[PDB]
Amino acid sequence: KCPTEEICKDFRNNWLGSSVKNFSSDNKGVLVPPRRQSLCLRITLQDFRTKKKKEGDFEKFIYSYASSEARKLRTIHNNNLEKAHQAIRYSFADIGNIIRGDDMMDTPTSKETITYLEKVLKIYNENNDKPKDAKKWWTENRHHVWEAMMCGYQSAQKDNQCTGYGNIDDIPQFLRWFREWGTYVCEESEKNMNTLKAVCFPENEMCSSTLKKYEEWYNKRKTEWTEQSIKYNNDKINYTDIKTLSPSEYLIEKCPECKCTKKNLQDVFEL
Amino acid sequence: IRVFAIPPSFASIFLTKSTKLTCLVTDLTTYDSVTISWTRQNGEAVKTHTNISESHPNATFSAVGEASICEDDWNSGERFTCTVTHTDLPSPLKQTISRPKGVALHRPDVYLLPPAREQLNLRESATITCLVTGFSPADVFVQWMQRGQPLSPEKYVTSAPMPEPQAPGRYFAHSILTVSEEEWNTGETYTCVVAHEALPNRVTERTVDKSTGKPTLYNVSLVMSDTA
Amino acid sequence: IRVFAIPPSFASIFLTKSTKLTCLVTDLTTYDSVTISWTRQNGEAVKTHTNISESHPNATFSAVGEASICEDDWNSGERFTCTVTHTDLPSPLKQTISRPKGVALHRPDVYLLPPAREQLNLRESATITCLVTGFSPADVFVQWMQRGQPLSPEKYVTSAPMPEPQAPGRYFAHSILTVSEEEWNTGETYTCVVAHEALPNRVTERTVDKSTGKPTLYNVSLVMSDTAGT
Amino acid sequence: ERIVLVDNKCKCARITSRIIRSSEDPNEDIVERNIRIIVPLNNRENISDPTSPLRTRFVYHLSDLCKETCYTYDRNKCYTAVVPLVYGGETKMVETALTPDACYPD
Numbered sequence A: 001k002c003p004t005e006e007i008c009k010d011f012r013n014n015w016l017g018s019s020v021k022n023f024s025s026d027n028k029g030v031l032v033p034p035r036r037q038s039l040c041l042r043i044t045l046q047d048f049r050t051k052k053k054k055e056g057d058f059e060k061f062i063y064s065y066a067s068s069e070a071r072k073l074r075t076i077h078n079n080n081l082e083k084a085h086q087a088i089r090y091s092f093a094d095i096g097n098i099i100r101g102d103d104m105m106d107t108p109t110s111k112e113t114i115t116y117l118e119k120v121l122k123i124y125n126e127n128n129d130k131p132k133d134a135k136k137w138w139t140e141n142r143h144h145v146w147e148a149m150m151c152g153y154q155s156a157q158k159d160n161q162c163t164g165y166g167n168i169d170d171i172p173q174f175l176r177w178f179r180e181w182g183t184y185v186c187e188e189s190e191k192n193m194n195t196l197k198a199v200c201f202p203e204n205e206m207c208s209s210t211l212k213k214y215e216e217w218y219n220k221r222k223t224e225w226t227e228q229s230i231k232y233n234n235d236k237i238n239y240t241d242i243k244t245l246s247p248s249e250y251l252i253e254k255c256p257e258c259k260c261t262k263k264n265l266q267d268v269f270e271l
Numbered sequence B: 001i002r003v004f005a006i007p008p009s010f011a012s013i014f015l016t017k018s019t020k021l022t023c024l025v026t027d028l029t030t031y032d033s034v035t036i037s038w039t040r041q042n043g044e045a046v047k048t049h050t051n052i053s054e055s056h057p058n059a060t061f062s063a064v065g066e067a068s069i070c071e072d073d074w075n076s077g078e079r080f081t082c083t084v085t086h087t088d089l090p091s092p093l094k095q096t097i098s099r100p101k102g103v104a105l106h107r108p109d110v111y112l113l114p115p116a117r118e119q120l121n122l123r124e125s126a127t128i129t130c131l132v133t134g135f136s137p138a139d140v141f142v143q144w145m146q147r148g149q150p151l152s153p154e155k156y157v158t159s160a161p162m163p164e165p166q167a168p169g170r171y172f173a174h175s176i177l178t179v180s181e182e183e184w185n186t187g188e189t190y191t192c193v194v195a196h197e198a199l200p201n202r203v204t205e206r207t208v209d210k211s212t213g214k215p216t217l218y219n220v221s222l223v224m225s226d227t228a
Numbered sequence C: 001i002r003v004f005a006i007p008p009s010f011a012s013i014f015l016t017k018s019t020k021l022t023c024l025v026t027d028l029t030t031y032d033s034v035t036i037s038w039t040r041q042n043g044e045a046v047k048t049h050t051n052i053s054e055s056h057p058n059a060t061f062s063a064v065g066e067a068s069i070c071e072d073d074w075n076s077g078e079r080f081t082c083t084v085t086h087t088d089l090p091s092p093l094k095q096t097i098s099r100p101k102g103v104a105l106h107r108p109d110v111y112l113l114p115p116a117r118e119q120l121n122l123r124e125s126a127t128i129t130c131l132v133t134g135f136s137p138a139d140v141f142v143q144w145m146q147r148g149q150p151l152s153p154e155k156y157v158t159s160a161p162m163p164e165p166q167a168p169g170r171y172f173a174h175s176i177l178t179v180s181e182e183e184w185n186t187g188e189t190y191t192c193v194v195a196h197e198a199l200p201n202r203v204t205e206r207t208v209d210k211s212t213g214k215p216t217l218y219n220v221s222l223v224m225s226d227t228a229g230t
Numbered sequence D: 001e002r003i004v005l006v007d008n009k010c011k012c013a014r015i016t017s018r019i020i021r022s023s024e025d026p027n028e029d030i031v032e033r034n035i036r037i038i039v040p041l042n043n044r045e046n047i048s049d050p051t052s053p054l055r056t057r058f059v060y061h062l063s064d065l066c067k068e069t070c071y072t073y074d075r076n077k078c079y080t081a082v083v084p085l086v087y088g089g090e091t092k093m094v095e096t097a098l099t100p101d102a103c104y105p106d
Ligand SMILES: *[C@@H]1O[C@H](CO)[C@@H](O[C@@H]2O[C@H](CO)[C@@H](O)[C@H](O)[C@H]2NC(C)=O)[C@H](O)[C@H]1NC(C)=O
Pocket: D045, D046, D048, D049
């Protein structure tokens, strides 16, 4: 289901330290992914004022930034296709949540793009009968953003493969960030445990060096694990489908692409 | 019998906008018939007390005894004396409260330093520091507002005052407010409020913006030649 | 008899290359019968102290200790307690301090903040601070210089590190340098050198002067010659 | 089709060229030499030694770099300068990294 050509013509790694809205009142322990930190989506008052004079400029501006973000993601994750596709999916759901105004980021863009979209739809769709609120606008036009950002992805290296969103936007931003963190942690844990079993479980200086590296990585990721786990515990009673599952078993079972097993995640984190 | 009557700090004075005197008993078994009161000059006795808890894990009677009294009474040296009448000691436990008059009174110099250029180039966050220097009582309160609206207390953190190396009498303190980098690029104005006794108005506000440390002059000179 | 033990900072680990452990004891009288033998996690004591301090302004005595342990052993994380057997103590007391396992290694974000223009306008003095943020563990050591030779310790003051409100896993610290205004005029190179575990080369440096940190003007001369090329 | 003639990494010159093509006719194509120079605006005479003051002069000889000091830092090679660090009475001579994330050990 690759998009048509004419619309295509028309259109660090530090998890901590990011800004979250009301960090202590709620969302205690959530970590912003570096991809979301380096997201190519910046909406200012000047851009909104310049794109509100003529019909269709704001939506096309959003599509242009989505395409730029997709191109940046594809140029970053060029080695693996699955990781690049999942980064595209995560960024698409992130920008959808930002459009819907459910973003927890403290940036003015997250708290202001919903107001900008409300104002644009109000000043231009008085009698057009199209939905004027951000939520229904995203609901009806989620396919257009997908096709535009897939065009932006395809311009990077002329990739024939195409993928659908596949029910990604309705997941809350915390759960998606948690899934991304779990995927990264599980991949790095598989690599580190494979190397450790190769070099230390069949010389001593190599074993000591890899042990120090593993201890440092584990010390960082255990604090990250505890923060995300307590955040999940504060924010799991709302949904009954995820209320009865521990974070580790939720990553193992309901996440198909996480590639997280008992030994990979639970036996090393939950002990 | 640890009746530690620590006077409330000036930051506490301008935080809750009320002067609550403290006379708390520590490490004592909880008993009854304890008639706490405050006695001042000329024999005035006005008091309201709450927060009484019978049970404590450390077996210490709370006896918090917080009463609202005007700031001018403290400014007049009313020598607020606690009069905890415990059962073991028939005489009331006298604990006076008064400002230590005689200390130096130097007004702080508030400087709102702009964020570093490299951190903004990293495009991760924007921490604006409020360097407060030169105050002798070392009782400073720092609060931040954006567009006249105070922020949440957890966004900004204030360090405890510590003595200045060059000036032994004066003290200095610092505080940082962390916001997004594009939030700084938006053009919002951040105000740093510094509360101190020595200030003529007891507070001082400084405003930071994008246009506070920008290069006022650019001296580019494009010279191109076709000869060696 | 109260004993205070200061853990060895990473600056003593790196610069000195020998971890000396001491526990000064205040409110203790001068008896001069101190034998502090540091003990491992087991019951076997390893080393005794070398030198002690006797003179005190308040006519007191401090039982400071010293021991030489290999750096790998100190990084391993066993319990080190200074077993004081002074006759002044009515009963033996044990103080337990060790390297706390559970602290991350985050690369510090060292930045240098130039003094504000108002402080320069007051013409009295200028304060130069270093923005060292996002480092773990909490320990940190920073030293200021001026054109290469080190400055006196009494000129710069280091603030106690505090947890970062945005990220509890990281810590921040501040250190101001009070300089005269005539020093800032025709400003010399003021450097912020800080040492921490998470740095690549274990030492980083940031340099500020009048024309770099928030400059009033950008004086540049840009010449191009032989545009034809070869 | 843009061809890169020369590229000095620590000067950041990036001398390139391309032949733009108009409609087919007797030769009127415009030959162009395209350069992209990134001025630092904050670097010194030595980018490694902090003691040297700010440099105002910006010298760019095209022929000299087509075939020494420069202004722009490199991401591949390391810039290490010797720096003094003092704990107490004695001092120890230690290395440092002028720029972060450039050539950190892996
Ligand atoms: C400024 O630049 C000069 C350029 O010659 C440098 O001086 C020497 O630079 C080489 C290059 O690595 C070093 O091996 C020498 O040790 C430097 N000389 C001295 C005396 O240190 C240096 O970078 C700067 N000049 C000085 C005097 O420091």
